[PDB]
Design an enzyme around this catalytic site. Structure first.
Site, mmCIF file in Angstrom:
data_model
loop_
_atom_site.group_PDB
_atom_site.id
_atom_site.type_symbol
_atom_site.label_atom_id
_atom_site.label_comp_id
_atom_site.label_asym_id
_atom_site.label_seq_id
_atom_site.Cartn_x
_atom_site.Cartn_y
_atom_site.Cartn_z
ATOM 1 N N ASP A 1 0.671 -0.918 -0.035
ATOM 2 C CA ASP A 1 -0.013 -0.114 0.066
ATOM 3 C C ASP A 1 0.960 1.323 -0.051
ATOM 4 O O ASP A 1 1.825 1.263 1.012
ATOM 5 C CB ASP A 1 -0.790 -0.036 1.263
ATOM 6 C CG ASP A 1 -1.941 0.920 1.158
ATOM 7 O OD1 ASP A 1 -2.489 1.244 0.015
ATOM 8 O OD2 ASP A 1 -2.178 1.791 2.221
ATOM 9 N N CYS B 1 -7.596 -1.967 -5.899
ATOM 10 C CA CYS B 1 -6.687 -2.329 -4.767
ATOM 11 C C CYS B 1 -7.514 -1.908 -3.498
ATOM 12 O O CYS B 1 -8.639 -2.197 -3.521
ATOM 13 C CB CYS B 1 -5.599 -1.241 -5.054
ATOM 14 S SG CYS B 1 -5.800 0.631 -5.477
ATOM 15 N N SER B 2 -6.807 -0.946 -2.779
ATOM 16 C CA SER B 2 -7.708 -0.794 -1.472
ATOM 17 C C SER B 2 -8.924 0.513 -1.619
ATOM 18 O O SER B 2 -10.027 0.140 -1.634
ATOM 19 C CB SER B 2 -7.089 -0.450 0.004
ATOM 20 O OG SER B 2 -7.907 -0.466 0.871
ATOM 21 N N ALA B 3 -8.176 1.607 -2.378
ATOM 22 C CA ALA B 3 -9.019 2.569 -2.529
ATOM 23 C C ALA B 3 -9.439 2.708 -3.943
ATOM 24 O O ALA B 3 -10.409 3.366 -4.235
ATOM 25 C CB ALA B 3 -8.258 4.050 -2.080
ATOM 26 N N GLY B 4 -8.839 2.038 -4.745
ATOM 27 C CA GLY B 4 -8.933 2.108 -6.166
ATOM 28 C C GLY B 4 -8.250 3.370 -6.812
ATOM 29 O O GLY B 4 -8.854 3.679 -7.856
ATOM 30 N N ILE B 5 -7.416 3.870 -6.475
ATOM 31 C CA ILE B 5 -6.519 5.162 -7.084
ATOM 32 C C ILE B 5 -5.161 4.883 -7.180
ATOM 33 O O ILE B 5 -4.547 5.401 -8.344
ATOM 34 C CB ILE B 5 -6.947 6.394 -6.275
ATOM 35 C CG1 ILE B 5 -6.642 6.250 -5.038
ATOM 36 C CG2 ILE B 5 -8.772 6.612 -6.424
ATOM 37 C CD1 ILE B 5 -6.955 7.851 -4.112
ATOM 38 N N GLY B 6 -4.424 4.580 -6.178
ATOM 39 C CA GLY B 6 -2.992 4.608 -6.473
ATOM 40 C C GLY B 6 -2.397 3.406 -7.099
ATOM 41 O O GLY B 6 -2.056 3.575 -8.068
ATOM 42 N N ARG B 7 -2.329 2.093 -6.303
ATOM 43 C CA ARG B 7 -1.936 1.123 -7.377
ATOM 44 C C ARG B 7 -2.655 0.785 -8.669
ATOM 45 O O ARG B 7 -2.158 0.476 -9.714
ATOM 46 C CB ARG B 7 -2.071 -0.169 -6.460
ATOM 47 C CG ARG B 7 -0.653 -0.088 -5.611
ATOM 48 C CD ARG B 7 -0.936 -1.358 -4.372
ATOM 49 N NE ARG B 7 -2.130 -0.864 -3.348
ATOM 50 C CZ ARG B 7 -2.439 -1.599 -2.278
ATOM 51 N NH1 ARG B 7 -1.856 -2.644 -1.852
ATOM 52 N NH2 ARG B 7 -3.358 -1.264 -1.472
ATOM 53 N N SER B 8 -4.060 1.099 -8.410
ATOM 54 C CA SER B 8 -4.920 1.060 -9.746
ATOM 55 C C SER B 8 -4.789 2.040 -10.760
ATOM 56 O O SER B 8 -4.554 1.693 -11.933
ATOM 57 C CB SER B 8 -6.716 1.022 -9.231
ATOM 58 O OG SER B 8 -7.017 -0.068 -8.346
ATOM 59 N N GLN C 1 -0.795 7.800 -6.291
ATOM 60 C CA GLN C 1 -0.994 8.253 -4.785
ATOM 61 C C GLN C 1 0.544 8.655 -4.168
ATOM 62 O O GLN C 1 0.560 9.496 -3.274
ATOM 63 C CB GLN C 1 -1.441 7.435 -3.913
ATOM 64 C CG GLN C 1 -2.951 7.119 -3.957
ATOM 65 C CD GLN C 1 -3.719 8.472 -3.302
ATOM 66 O OE1 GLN C 1 -3.566 8.545 -2.071
ATOM 67 N NE2 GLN C 1 -4.291 9.295 -4.189
HETATM 68 O O1 LIG Z 1 -1.013 2.797 -3.210
HETATM 69 C C1 LIG Z 1 -2.021 2.956 -2.941
HETATM 70 C C2 LIG Z 1 -2.920 3.926 -1.934
HETATM 71 N N1 LIG Z 1 -3.915 3.667 -1.706
HETATM 72 C C3 LIG Z 1 -4.850 4.529 -0.804
HETATM 73 C C4 LIG Z 1 -5.669 5.854 -1.196
HETATM 74 C C5 LIG Z 1 -6.341 6.622 -0.289
HETATM 75 C C6 LIG Z 1 -6.564 5.948 1.060
HETATM 76 C C7 LIG Z 1 -5.970 4.679 1.563
HETATM 77 C C8 LIG Z 1 -5.230 4.095 0.429
HETATM 78 S S1 LIG Z 1 -4.819 2.802 -2.697
HETATM 79 O O2 LIG Z 1 -5.559 1.473 -2.144
HETATM 80 O O3 LIG Z 1 -5.538 3.305 -3.896
HETATM 81 N N2 LIG Z 1 -3.239 2.235 -3.617
#
Ligand SMILES: O=C1CN(c2ccccc2)S(=O)(=O)N1
Length: 297
Positions: free
Chosen positions: A181, A215-222, A262
């Site tokens: 993450d 991924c978890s939030a769907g913006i960083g790794r995704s 992110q």
């Molecule tokens: O690298 C990342 C960081 N992420 C994130 C973004 C916002 C809140 C919590 C986690 S993600 O799950 O979109 N991938």
């Protein structure tokens, strides 16, 4: 390639943080009214990560059509992706409903159910073939047909059935298990090996609905995954890697979903993957096996 020169330029002056923060400042801002409605509070994993109203995916049900998911339509590259948050215990039914209604063939998961000691995603798919999952609310059945476990990723063959019509579809689940993450892949080789595996399955093809990435939030790794794929597709169309402006593409994607990519290092890694991937697009078939080797699959 222009990006390659730019890469060294930024890397030399060590200004990735500045470059990245500039993208954040220029990024689009659109209303997320529906996502913020009180009745949807329990459908969002993170209070600060919401889909824009204009590009959110709508579920086909009178009750509540909301799901934290965005349709990223890259007109120029001619490919669409659906980026969504890791499903919650109460939105797993909504998730598969979306996969069905949108006619997706593959699902790309870049996180683990548990990371840093916390639950980042619900166990939304069956782990044993003998124990299928049934989602009452959306009337869908999900069965594990087979799985191919590798060093850092697993590919599963799932069978999704609409209990109402009794239709059946094969869904491929691509699970990257070693992407931390707010982190980056072990190497571009490892990432590219995985991306091409998804590509070779036909999951990203236009004959099917958009692939679902999360991924978890769907913006960083995704975001990193999609940025790399789109940039490679673009230079592939023209067969000219110099015509791709990585930052412009990221900004175009951010018109559809907030905060894609992110950290400054995830942006840097994106450049690495694309520059490396260009080797293949330019006619070097041997690098794919080279990546498979270095990936320690
Ligand atoms: O690298 C990342 C960081 N992420 C994130 C973004 C916002 C809140 C919590 C986690 S993600 O799950 O979109 N991938």
């Amino acid at each position: 390639m222009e990006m390659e020169k730019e890469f060294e330029q930024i890397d030399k002056s060590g200004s990735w943080a500045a470059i990245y923060q500039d993208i954040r400042h220029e990024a689009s801002d659109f209303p997320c009214r529906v996502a913020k409605l009180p009745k949807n509070k329990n459908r969002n994993r993170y209070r600060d990560v919401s889909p824009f109203d204009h590009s959110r995916i709508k579920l086909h049900q009178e009750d509540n059509d909301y799901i934290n998911a965005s349709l990223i339509k890259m007109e120029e590259a001619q490919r669409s992706y659906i980026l969504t948050q890791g499903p919650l215990p109460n939105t797993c039914g909504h998730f598969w409903e979306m996969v069905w209604e949108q006619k997706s063939r593959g699902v790309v998961m870049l996180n683990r159910v548990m990371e840093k000691g916390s639950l980042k995603c619900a166990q939304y798919w069956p782990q044993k073939e003998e124990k299928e999952m049934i989602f009452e609310d959306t009337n869908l059945k999900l069965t594990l047909i087979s799985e191919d476990i590798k060093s850092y990723y697993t590919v599963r063959q799932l069978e999704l059935e609409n209990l109402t019509t009794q239709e059946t579809r094969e869904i491929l689940h691509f699970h990257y298990t070693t992407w931390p993450d707010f982190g980056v892949p072990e190497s571009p080789a490892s990432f590219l090996n995985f991306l091409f595996k998804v590509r070779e399955s036909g999951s990203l093809s236009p004959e099917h609905g958009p692939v679902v990435v999360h991924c978890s939030a769907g913006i960083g790794r995704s975001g990193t995954f999609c940025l790399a794929d789109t940039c490679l597709l673009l230079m592939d169309k023209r067969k000219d890697p110099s015509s791709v402006d990585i930052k412009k593409v990221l900004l175009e994607m951010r018109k559809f979903r907030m905060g894609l990519i992110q950290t400054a290092d995830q942006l840097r890694f994106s450049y690495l993957a694309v520059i490396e991937g260009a080797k293949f697009i330019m006619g070097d078939s041997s690098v794919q096996d080279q990546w498979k080797e270095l990936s320690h699959e």
